[PDB]
Amino acid sequence: NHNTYFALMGTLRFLGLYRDEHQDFRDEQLRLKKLRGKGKPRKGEGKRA
Amino acid sequence: ELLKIPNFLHLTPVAIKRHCEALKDFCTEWPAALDSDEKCEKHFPIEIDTADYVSAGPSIRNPKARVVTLRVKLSSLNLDDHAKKKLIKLVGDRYCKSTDVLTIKTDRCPLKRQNYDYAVYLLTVLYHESWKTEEWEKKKTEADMEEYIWENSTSEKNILETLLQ
Amino acid sequence: YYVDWKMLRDVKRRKMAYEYADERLRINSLRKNTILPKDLQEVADEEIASLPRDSCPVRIRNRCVMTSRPRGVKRRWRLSRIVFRHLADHGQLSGVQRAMW
Amino acid sequence: KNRAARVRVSKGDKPVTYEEAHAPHYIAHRKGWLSLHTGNLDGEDHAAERTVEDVFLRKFMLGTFPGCLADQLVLKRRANQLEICALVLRQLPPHKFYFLVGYSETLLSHFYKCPVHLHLQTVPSKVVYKYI
Amino acid sequence: PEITISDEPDTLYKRLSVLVKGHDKAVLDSYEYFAVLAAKELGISIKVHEPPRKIERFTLLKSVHIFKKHRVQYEMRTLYRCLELEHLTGSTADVYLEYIQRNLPEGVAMEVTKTKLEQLPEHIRKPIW
Amino acid sequence: PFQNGFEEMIQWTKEGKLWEFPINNEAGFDDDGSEFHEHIFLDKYLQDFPKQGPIRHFMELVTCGLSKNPYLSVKQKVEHIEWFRNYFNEKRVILKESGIQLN
RNA sequence: UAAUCGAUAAACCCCGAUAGACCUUACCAACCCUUGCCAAUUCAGCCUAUAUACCGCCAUCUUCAGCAAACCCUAAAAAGGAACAAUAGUAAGCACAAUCAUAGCACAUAAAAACGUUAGGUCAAGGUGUAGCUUAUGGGUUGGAAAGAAAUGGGCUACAUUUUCUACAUAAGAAUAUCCACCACACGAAAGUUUUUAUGAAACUAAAAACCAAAGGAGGAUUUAGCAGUAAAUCAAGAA
Ligand SMILES: [Mg+2]
Ligand SMILES: [Mg+2]
Ligand SMILES: [Mg+2]
Ligand SMILES: [Mg+2]
Ligand SMILES: [Mg+2]
Ligand SMILES: [Mg+2]
Ligand SMILES: [Mg+2]
Ligand SMILES: [Mg+2]
Ligand SMILES: [Mg+2]
Ligand SMILES: [Mg+2]
Ligand SMILES: [Mg+2]
Ligand SMILES: [Mg+2]
Ligand SMILES: [Mg+2]
Ligand SMILES: [Mg+2]
Ligand SMILES: [Mg+2]
Ligand SMILES: [Mg+2]
Ligand SMILES: [Mg+2]
Ligand SMILES: [Mg+2]
Ligand SMILES: [Mg+2]
Ligand SMILES: [Mg+2]
Ligand SMILES: [Mg+2]
Ligand SMILES: [Mg+2]
Ligand SMILES: [Mg+2]
Ligand SMILES: [Mg+2]
Ligand SMILES: [Mg+2]
Ligand SMILES: [Mg+2]
Ligand SMILES: [Mg+2]
Ligand SMILES: [Mg+2]
Ligand SMILES: [Mg+2]
Ligand SMILES: [Mg+2]
Ligand SMILES: [Mg+2]
Ligand SMILES: [Mg+2]
Ligand SMILES: [Mg+2]
Ligand SMILES: [Mg+2]
Ligand SMILES: [Mg+2]
Numbered sequence: 001n002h003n004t005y006f007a008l009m010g011t012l013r014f015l016g017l018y019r020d021e022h023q024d025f026r027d028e029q030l031r032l033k034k035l036r037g038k039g040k041p042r043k044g045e046g047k048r049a
Numbered sequence: 050e051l052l053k054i055p056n057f058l059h060l061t062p063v064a065i066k067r068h069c070e071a072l073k074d075f076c077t078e079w080p081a082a083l084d085s086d087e088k089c090e091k092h093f094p095i096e097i098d099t100a101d102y103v104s105a106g107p108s109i110r111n112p113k114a115r116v117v118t119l120r121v122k123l124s125s126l127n128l129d130d131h132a133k134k135k136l137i138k139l140v141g142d143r144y145c146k147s148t149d150v151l152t153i154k155t156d157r158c159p160l161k162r163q164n165y166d167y168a169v170y171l172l173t174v175l176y177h178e179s180w181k182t183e184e185w186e187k188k189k190t191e192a193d194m195e196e197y198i199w200e201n202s203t204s205e206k207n208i209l210e211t212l213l214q
Numbered sequence: 215y216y217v218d219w220k221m222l223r224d225v226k227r228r229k230m231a232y233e234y235a236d237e238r239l240r241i242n243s244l245r246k247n248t249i250l251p252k253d254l255q256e257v258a259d260e261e262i263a264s265l266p267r268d269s270c271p272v273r274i275r276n277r278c279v280m281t282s283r284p285r286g287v288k289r290r291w292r293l294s295r296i297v298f299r300h301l302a303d304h305g306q307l308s309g310v311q312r313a314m315w
Numbered sequence: 316k317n318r319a320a321r322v323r324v325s326k327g328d329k330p331v332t333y334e335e336a337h338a339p340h341y342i343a344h345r346k347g348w349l350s351l352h353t354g355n356l357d358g359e360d361h362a363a364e365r366t367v368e369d370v371f372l373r374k375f376m377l378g379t380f381p382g383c384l385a386d387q388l389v390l391k392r393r394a395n396q397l398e399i400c401a402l403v404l405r406q407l408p409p410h411k412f413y414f415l416v417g418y419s420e421t422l423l424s425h426f427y428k429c430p431v432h433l434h435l436q437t438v439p440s441k442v443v444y445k446y447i
Numbered sequence: 448p449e450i451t452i453s454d455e456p457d458t459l460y461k462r463l464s465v466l467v468k469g470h471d472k473a474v475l476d477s478y479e480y481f482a483v484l485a486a487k488e489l490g491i492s493i494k495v496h497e498p499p500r501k502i503e504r505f506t507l508l509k510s511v512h513i514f515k516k517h518r519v520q521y522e523m524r525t526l527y528r529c530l531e532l533e534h535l536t537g538s539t540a541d542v543y544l545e546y547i548q549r550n551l552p553e554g555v556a557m558e559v560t561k562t563k564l565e566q567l568p569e570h571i572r573k574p575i576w
Numbered sequence: 577p578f579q580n581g582f583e584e585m586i587q588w589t590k591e592g593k594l595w596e597f598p599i600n601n602e603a604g605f606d607d608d609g610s611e612f613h614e615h616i617f618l619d620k621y622l623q624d625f626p627k628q629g630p631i632r633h634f635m636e637l638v639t640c641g642l643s644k645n646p647y648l649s650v651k652q653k654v655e656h657i658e659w660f661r662n663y664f665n666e667k668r669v670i671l672k673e674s675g676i677q678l679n
Numbered sequence: 680u681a682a683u684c685g686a687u688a689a690a691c692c693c694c695g696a697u698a699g700a701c702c703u704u705a706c707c708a709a710c711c712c713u714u715g716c717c718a719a720u721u722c723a724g725c726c727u728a729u730a731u732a733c734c735g736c737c738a739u740c741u742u743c744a745g746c747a748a749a750c751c752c753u754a755a756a757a758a759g760g761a762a763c764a765a766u767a768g769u770a771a772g773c774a775c776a777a778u779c780a781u782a783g784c785a786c787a788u789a790a791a792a793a794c795g796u797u798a799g800g801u802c803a804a805g806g807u808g809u810a811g812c813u814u815a816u817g818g819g820u821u822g823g824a825a826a827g828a829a830a831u832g833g834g835c836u837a838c839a840u841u842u843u844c845u846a847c848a849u850a851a852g853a854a855u856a857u858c859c860a861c862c863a864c865a866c867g868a869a870a871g872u873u874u875u876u877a878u879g880a881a882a883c884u885a886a887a888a889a890c891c892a893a894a895g896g897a898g899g900a901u902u903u904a905g906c907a908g909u910a911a912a913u914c915a916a917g918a919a
Pocket of ligand 30: 851
């Protein structure tokens with residue numbers, strides 16, 4: 001079960017036990033992506049506007 | 050790379066001496082006279098072959114475990130001539146004709162106790178129905194014979210015609 | 215999260231193929247029998263035909279476990295050759311060595 | 316050129332453990348095995364599950380022990396219990412080490428539903444077989 | 448160490464055969480020394496042989512996308528040792544195999560075939576139906 | 577607290593966490609208490625069925641099949657033969673129309 | 680064709696596939712669903728554009744002997760640096776060599792093969808840098824594809840007497856392209872057409888019989904591969 005390992009390790013991460021450098025890379029990069037101003041649009045907003 | 054190597058350290062020979070001397074108390078003795086295979090046959094004719102497999106992992110369940118084998122020499126059975134040969138024709142392939150060994154492999158049941166009880170069951174059943182003569186056994190074809198009986202033969206009528214002439 | 219939507223639909227195909235399994239076996243018991251009437255067999259035909267086709271055995275696809283690669287899968291390890299080789303070469307795979315003879 | 320699991324030649328300064336200094340083609344010649352279990356032998360079953368288990372144990376041990384893991388993780392599997400052997404650097408104080416030891420043993424015994432045993436051996440600096 | 452004696456007639460084994468499978472030779476050599484020295488102390492009277500090795504070789508494509516002229520070849524070797532014990536008891540069997548099994552190495556597996564001695568079953572003894 | 581590695585093993589084994597030696601692969605699975613003549617001989621559930629009909633041909637192959645099967649207990653086999661009774665009697669019209677009177 | 684992609688000089692062309700009827704599946708045709716797999720997240724999900732942004736795996740020169748830090752010399756130094764009756768070179772590192780594997784040797788094969796080259800291959804193994812999609816470039820159901828006028832690469836089977844059949848395993852018996860009206864047969868149907876059977880919910884697949892017996896009579900320019908248990912011929916096994 002992939003849901004199991006995924007969720008379990010993510011929890012253990014936010015609970016500050018396990019440490020994910022991949023998720024940290026991802027996070028930091030979306031941080032520098034949105035800080036730039038190109039983010040992920042709030043649903044419904046992007047196309048028509 | 051010395052951490053991957055199994056260390057036999059705990060099994061160092063001093064430890065085997067002391068361990069097997071403290072394990073001397075659990076084991077039970079072996080009977081004298083049975084020392085030869087001959088007396089083993091005259092006393093216990095039957096062999097029961099049981100398989101046990103250990104591997105590492107969370108689960109202990111092994112599919113190959115269930116198989117039960119019976120090896121019985123037909124010379125050690127009380128069988129009649131008729132019973133013995135009707136049994137040969139009855140069991141067939143499970144019978145080896147040179148060494149006189151009968152083999153029953155039992156599978157069909159989940160637990161090995163059940164394969165053992167059903168194999169010895171097959172043994173008892175074949176023995177009980179080897180002694181029952183029925184209607185169709187008097188219907189026996191002479192082609193069905195394991196022997197050539199001199200009675201009612203073709204060579205007999207060839208002899209009687211040649212001596213007639 | 216299963217690594218793909220592929221592995222999503224195929225997992226649902228494993229659950230389903232386990233669920234209607236008994237139905238399959240028992241219907242196909244009559245359907246594949248000669249002795250029984252052809253008439254019970256036409257009805258048994260409409261019967262296994264009625265079952266959701268997501269619950270049938272052959273709609274299931276073997277994929278590599280972690281990398282989801284549909285093909286080039288080694289049955290015993292359930293692993294794609296890329297990942298197999300990767301794992302065995304680091305020696306993380308037990309007993310697997312490079313063959314010389 | 317064969318790129319499988321190798322460490323390229325640098326200007327000659329690159330510190331290298333005995334483990335990564337030997338190409339895959341050396342396995343069982345010089346190199347031993349990282350994981351040990353019954354599953355790939357001639358007559359045996361469930362190699363796949365011991366493999367999944369192995370992978371996740373790599374991920375788990377490298378994420379649970381940030382920055383202090385010295386060399387690649389040695390997995391032993393004996394009589395249903397897993398002996399996880401890790402060569403680990405000295406970074407954190409003994410308190411957090413035993414905390415995470417108990418933590419890991421408990422969570423691993425309970426997830427894999429089988430008794431786990433964890434052995435840590437501490438090393439002053441990453442072992443260097445070559446270069447340096 | 449609690450020991451108890453039940454009146455029932457303990458099981459006999461004609462031949463207790465133990466197969467030890469492995470990858471590496473050395474471990475099975477050492478383990479052989481172990482089982483031999485353990486079965487000597489208990490006066491079990493055993494033999495050992497080496498069943499010929501079996502090698503499986505399968506091949507994978509060397510590259511991610513396409514070169515089919517290039518192949519990697521991987522190998523799994525299984526080596527054998529067989530312990531043959533003759534004329535042992537049931538209890539001696541349970542103890543010796545307990546001691547042998549608890550210590551079994553991580554890379555090696557073990558398959559035991561026991562041929563156990565039974566006289567005859569009851570409905571067969573000398574009745575005829 | 578632990579005095580020795582043997583104390584470790586001992587406690588794990590009492591707890592039932594450590595494995596049982598010398599290992600029998602059937603440890604922990606009792607198989608419902610069943611014996612072979614509850615597995616092998618299915619006559620019990622063949623009682624209610626037309627006796628000389630081809631339904632006995634089909635059900636004798638089903639029976640002989642469920643006999644050879646280590647993979648299922650008593651219960652599920654019985655559920656099989658029962659589902660078969662229920663379905664065979666479910667359609668009374670087909671059996672009679674087919675050209676053989678079937679009970 | 681409404682109806683994938685990628686490889687495509689040596690180093691593409693029974694190639695990613697050790698494997699597409701559904702599935703796999705990216706594709707087209709319709710239809711449906713918008714915190715839409717997860718403990719939580721104005722967040723998910725994207726076989727969308729970039730292999731000339733890359734990691735991973737590889738090809739290739741190549742079974743080529745070199746490649747590189749540390750120094751030291753040269754009436755300047757872009758650079759070069761050996762001569763064994765030796766003239767400025769010393770150098771650990773890494774290749775090759777040596778050892779391992781082929782259950783003893785020796786050989787052979789296998790493996791090994793650095794540095795760089797070909798912006799060589801692959802964002803469809805997977806993972807990501809940059810850009811995009813977010814009631815859609817996302818997620819589901821259902822049905823649909825893969826048709827040949829050709830052109831060609833690779834194979835298999837042959838064109839027959841060193842052959843063909845049956846026995847059979849290695850002394851046998853018969854057949855044998857022209858007699859001629861054969862009640863056609865000599866080779867050669869792997870192709871078609873019928874009926875079965877394997878599997879499968881679904882035969883478009885596969886196997887076996889019977890029928891049919893066609894092109895083909897050793898093939899143009901031009902070329903592949905092999906130095907010994909090899910080529911060639913005959914047989915089986917396994918992977919999915
Ligand atoms: Mg399939
Ligand atoms: Mg190469
Ligand atoms: Mg194309
Ligand atoms: Mg293209
Ligand atoms: Mg090119
Ligand atoms: Mg190219
Ligand atoms: Mg080719
Ligand atoms: Mg399709
Ligand atoms: Mg898409
Ligand atoms: Mg372009
Ligand atoms: Mg490139
Ligand atoms: Mg390209
Ligand atoms: Mg590259
Ligand atoms: Mg040189
Ligand atoms: Mg240099
Ligand atoms: Mg210079
Ligand atoms: Mg050698
Ligand atoms: Mg050589
Ligand atoms: Mg080579
Ligand atoms: Mg070499
Ligand atoms: Mg070389
Ligand atoms: Mg290019
Ligand atoms: Mg990607
Ligand atoms: Mg990205
Ligand atoms: Mg879509
Ligand atoms: Mg579709
Ligand atoms: Mg042509
Ligand atoms: Mg050929
Ligand atoms: Mg040919
Ligand atoms: Mg002849
Ligand atoms: Mg044909
Ligand atoms: Mg013809
Ligand atoms: Mg002609
Ligand atoms: Mg030429
Ligand atoms: Mg050849």
